[PDB]
Amino acid sequence: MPVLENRAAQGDITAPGGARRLTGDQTAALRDSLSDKPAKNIILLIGDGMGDSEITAARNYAEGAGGFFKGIDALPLTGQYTHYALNKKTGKPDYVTDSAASATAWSTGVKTYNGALGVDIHEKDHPTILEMAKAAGLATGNVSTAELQDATPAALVAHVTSRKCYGPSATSEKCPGNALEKGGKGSITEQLLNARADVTLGGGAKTFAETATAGEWQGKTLREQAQARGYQLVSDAASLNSVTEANQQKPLLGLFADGNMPVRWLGPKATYHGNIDKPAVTCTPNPQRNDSVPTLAQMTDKAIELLSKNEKGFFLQVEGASIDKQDHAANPCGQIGETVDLDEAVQRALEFAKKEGNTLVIVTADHAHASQIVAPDTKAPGLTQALNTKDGAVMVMSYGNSEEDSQENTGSQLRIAAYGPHAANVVGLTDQTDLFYTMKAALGLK
Amino acid sequence: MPVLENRAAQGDITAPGGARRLTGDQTAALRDSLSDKPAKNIILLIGDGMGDSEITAARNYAEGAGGFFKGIDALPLTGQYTHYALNKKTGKPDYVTDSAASATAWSTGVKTYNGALGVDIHEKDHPTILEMAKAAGLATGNVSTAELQDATPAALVAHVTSRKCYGPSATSEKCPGNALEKGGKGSITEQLLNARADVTLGGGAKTFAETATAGEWQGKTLREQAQARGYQLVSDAASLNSVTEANQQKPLLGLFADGNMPVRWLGPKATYHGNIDKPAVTCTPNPQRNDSVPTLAQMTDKAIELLSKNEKGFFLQVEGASIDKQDHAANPCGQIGETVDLDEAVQRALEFAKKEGNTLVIVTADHAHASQIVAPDTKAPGLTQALNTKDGAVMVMSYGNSEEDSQENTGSQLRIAAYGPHAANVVGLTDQTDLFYTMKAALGLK
Numbered sequence: 001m002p003v004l005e006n007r008a009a010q011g012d013i014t015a016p017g018g019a020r021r022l023t024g025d026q027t028a029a030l031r032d033s034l035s036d037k038p039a040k041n042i043i044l045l046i047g048d049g050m051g052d053s054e055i056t057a058a059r060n061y062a063e064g065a066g067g068f069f070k071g072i073d074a075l076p077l078t079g080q081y082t083h084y085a086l087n088k089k090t091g092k093p094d095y096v097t098d099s100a101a102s103a104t105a106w107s108t109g110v111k112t113y114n115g116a117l118g119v120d121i122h123e124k125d126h127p128t129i130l131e132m133a134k135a136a137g138l139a140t141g142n143v144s145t146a147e148l149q150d151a152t153p154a155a156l157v158a159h160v161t162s163r164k165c166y167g168p169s170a171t172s173e174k175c176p177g178n179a180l181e182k183g184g185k186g187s188i189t190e191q192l193l194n195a196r197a198d199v200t201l202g203g204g205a206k207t208f209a210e211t212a213t214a215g216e217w218q219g220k221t222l223r224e225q226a227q228a229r230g231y232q233l234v235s236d237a238a239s240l241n242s243v244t245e246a247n248q249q250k251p252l253l254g255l256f257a258d259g260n261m262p263v264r265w266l267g268p269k270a271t272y273h274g275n276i277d278k279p280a281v282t283c284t285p286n287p288q289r290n291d292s293v294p295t296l297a298q299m300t301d302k303a304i305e306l307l308s309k310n311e312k313g314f315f316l317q318v319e320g321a322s323i324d325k326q327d328h329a330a331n332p333c334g335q336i337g338e339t340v341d342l343d344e345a346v347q348r349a350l351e352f353a354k355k356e357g358n359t360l361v362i363v364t365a366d367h368a369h370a371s372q373i374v375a376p377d378t379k380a381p382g383l384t385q386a387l388n389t390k391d392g393a394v395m396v397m398s399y400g401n402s403e404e405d406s407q408e409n410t411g412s413q414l415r416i417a418a419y420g421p422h423a424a425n426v427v428g429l430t431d432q433t434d435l436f437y438t439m440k441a442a443l444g445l446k
Numbered sequence: 447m448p449v450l451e452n453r454a455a456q457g458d459i460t461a462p463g464g465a466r467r468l469t470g471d472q473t474a475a476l477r478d479s480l481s482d483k484p485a486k487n488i489i490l491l492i493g494d495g496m497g498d499s500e501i502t503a504a505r506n507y508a509e510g511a512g513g514f515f516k517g518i519d520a521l522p523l524t525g526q527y528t529h530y531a532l533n534k535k536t537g538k539p540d541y542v543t544d545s546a547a548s549a550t551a552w553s554t555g556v557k558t559y560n561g562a563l564g565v566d567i568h569e570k571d572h573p574t575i576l577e578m579a580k581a582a583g584l585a586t587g588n589v590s591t592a593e594l595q596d597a598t599p600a601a602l603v604a605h606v607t608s609r610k611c612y613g614p615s616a617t618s619e620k621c622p623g624n625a626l627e628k629g630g631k632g633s634i635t636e637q638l639l640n641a642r643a644d645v646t647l648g649g650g651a652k653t654f655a656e657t658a659t660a661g662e663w664q665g666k667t668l669r670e671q672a673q674a675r676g677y678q679l680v681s682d683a684a685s686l687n688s689v690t691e692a693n694q695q696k697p698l699l700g701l702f703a704d705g706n707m708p709v710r711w712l713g714p715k716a717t718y719h720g721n722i723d724k725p726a727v728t729c730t731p732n733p734q735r736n737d738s739v740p741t742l743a744q745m746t747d748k749a750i751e752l753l754s755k756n757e758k759g760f761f762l763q764v765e766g767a768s769i770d771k772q773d774h775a776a777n778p779c780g781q782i783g784e785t786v787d788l789d790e791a792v793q794r795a796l797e798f799a800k801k802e803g804n805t806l807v808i809v810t811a812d813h814a815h816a817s818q819i820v821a822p823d824t825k826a827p828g829l830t831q832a833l834n835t836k837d838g839a840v841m842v843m844s845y846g847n848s849e850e851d852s853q854e855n856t857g858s859q860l861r862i863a864a865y866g867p868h869a870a871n872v873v874g875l876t877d878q879t880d881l882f883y884t885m886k887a888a889l890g891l892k
């Protein structure tokens with residue numbers, strides 16, 4: 001099964017056929033990409049708010065318009081999937097979902113209301129793909145650059161009526177029914193400790209400081225509970241590399257930040273008429289990213305190394321998180337840098353899958369965002385910025401869907417791409433809930 | 447080779463698996479969609495400004511979120527393609543293209559500057575896929591709901607430095623080098639007459655009223671010249687149905703409007719805070735669309751009927767045009783209605799292809815547009831409107847990339863889907879220029 005080695009413009013863009021990305025007929029290579037054999041492992045890479053526009057913007061900037069992302073763009077089977085949510089009251093569609101409902105959709109196979117984690121419109125719990133995988137004896141990994149309590153990584157191990165129920169404090173106010181002290185299953189973080197995936201890596205260390213309002217570890221901090229539960233705590237790249245085993249006896253928990261991990265690139269926020277008033281921006285590497293802080297690619301690599309030892313196979317979800325946060329913050333550089341980050345991760349996952357032969361790798365997003373690539377002389381009503389691309393040209397980015405700073409999400413259907421056994425199930429129009437069923441089946445979960 | 451009969455939500459959206467579009471594993475069906483055998487015919491359907499977002503909004507409104515367009519969504523092989531243009535001066539990429547440069551890129555295989563038709567950055571002409579097809583003896587069709595002098599349909603038959611050179615008048619001012627009177631090849635319209643496709647159907651009748659500044663037909667109106675050249679002129683549905691033959695000896699020319707043909711659906715323009723201040727809109731059929739005016743579907747059906755008689759095969763380009771004009775005009779209803787129109791056309795094309803077995807059907811857009819599906823309570827900086835979907839829910843549309851009314855184009859990569867011999871060449875990431883090469887090769891043009 002081949003990966004697209006190179007789909008960059010073959011030559012002189014200005015010349016006939018120079019802009020081509022193909023060098024010949026693809027029928028044969030596609031036929032070699034079709035396999036219904038079982039997938040031993042599954043690696044799901046989620047780019048936060050990374051719809052087609054975000055991908056085009058990051059490529060234009062980092063690789064040039066005729067460029068090619070070695071990871072993100074190298075997946076051969078591609079399609080578009082819908083991700084609408086449901087209105088909790090009426091049960092009718094809610095055309096624009098949040099991170100929480102979408103994450104739930106692919107992690108359980110059931111649509112839900114915005115803000116829900118692991119439950120349907122009736123607040124009924126439904127087992128996630130991770131729980132199912134774990135129950136079947138597979139190894140499981142949940143990796144993210146955001147806070148572990150955030151919608152994407154949280155959805156695999158928590159079942160709460162509101163995504164805001166991070167720890168004890170918020171839960172009692174926002175999710176009384178899930179509140180431990182009220183006989184509920186606990187907050188997001190508590191449920192995460194209970195779920196016991198073999199490898200969990202991310203930010204969100206802050207909430208681990210809260211103390212349990214009830215149970216065996218009542219009075220202890222969630223951090224203290226984790227140690228007591230048998231978890232290996234790691235807070236930096238060095239200690240992470242030191243890890244040699246991660247299992248149900250010694251589950252791994254990497255907390256590398258109080259909240260979200262540091263952004264890759266720094267750059268100014270988009271502003272009114274910024275493409276006109278301000279000069280073109282050139283993004284710059286964040287000094288605080290640190291050699292101490294593991295990158296999404298490193299965490300992905302360590303995760304695969306450890307999960308790999310499980311003879312039965314594994315399920316790993318990886319999230320290039322800061323993308324949509326920077327998209328909300330109308331910050332081009334942060335957004336684009338987070339897509340480059342993801343791409344490096346997708347490469348590590350593709351290398352492993354390629355050599356292993358039985359791994360299904362899927363790269364997609366939870367929902368779409370606000371960013372639009374517009375003409376450079378554009379006089380847009382919202383926030384804009386001009387960027388200096390690898391092509392040595394100017395690209396203007398617009399965020400015009402919200403007045404309240406935070407650029408909202410959108411409902412456009414977006415790209416889903418895959419490689420490996422069963423990847424054919426992402427081609428054409430599909431629904432985000434199909435993704436749950438594809439992974440379940442590919443993995444033979446039953 | 448199968449078409450997706452149904453990818454609608456299988457059942458109850460609120461229940462587990464109810465929102466699924468798949469009913470089983472697609473590996474086998476995909477294997478049956480792969481064929482490198484030769485394509486006898488090619489039918490290319492272009493939705494003007496019909497990116498993924500436009501497709502999602504038109505589905506939500508006309509079919510419901512869990513709906514399925516029988517045409518547009520039924521194509522099995524899908525991917526995403528880039529359509530960046532080039533800056534005439536520097537030769538560097540111009541991230542947001544217009545309809546002229548994009549049309550030229552798929553019709554000739556060479557990238558050009560915005561505004562050009564059938565020429566590269568150096569103003570050098572390059573032969574179009576239609577000219578090449580005709581030269582090889584295949585029948586050729588050029589159908590559009592727009593004015594025949596507009597960028598998309600014009601690009602197949604004209605070679606001018608500016609898309610504005612409609613007829614003699616504009617050409618002398620805008621394109622002196624193409625100006626007939628100055629020894630040039632002539633305006634868009636004149637060159638169209640010269641190209642002599644077997645079937646040309648659309649609007650733009652107004653310009654045929656101009657008189658030739660030179661040549662054999664100097665002093666005669668372009669309409670008069672057409673008659674004199676041997677063309678069959680048709681201006682309404684009835685006369686169009688009367689046509690039984692269309693060939694090189696009796697080429698067909700249907701001019702059903704002075705400009706663009708009538709929009710299917712009427713509705714109010716999007717406005718500032720319109721989703722808040724104004725009530726939800728329900729689009730209404732346009733009374734002036736007329737039983738006298740053939741629909742894009744009908745024109746597609748007639749064109750396939752006539753082109754069909756050529757033993758050697760045919761190439762047909764069809765354009766659901768009023769879509770981006772209505773997108774520019776921030777008019778949801780017009781835009782959406784144009785997408786439904788196209789869908790009917792794609793259906794007609796897909797039935798023929800399915801039965802014929804050697805026809806490659808491709809559906810895609812020239813470039814992306816402004817439309818974004820946003821939460822209903824959105825307070826966006828631009829124009830917005832709330833619509834009453836088939837789901838009996840509200841969907842809000844936002845146009846916020848321009849202040850100067852006309853909502854500009856965007857540079858996001860968008861969907862390209864196909865069915866038949868060689869459709870595998872649209873899967874994954876490709877460039878709009880690859881489309882020219884795929885068609886040339888499938889058709890074996892040489």
Ligand SMILES: [Mg+2]
Nearest residue numbers: 048099151152
């Ligand atoms: Mg998230």
Ligand SMILES: [Mg+2]
Nearest residue numbers: 545596597598
């Ligand atoms: Mg056009």
Ligand SMILES: [Zn+2]
Nearest residue numbers: 049099324366
């Ligand atoms: Zn998100």
Ligand SMILES: [Zn+2]
Nearest residue numbers: 494495545812
């Ligand atoms: Zn267009």
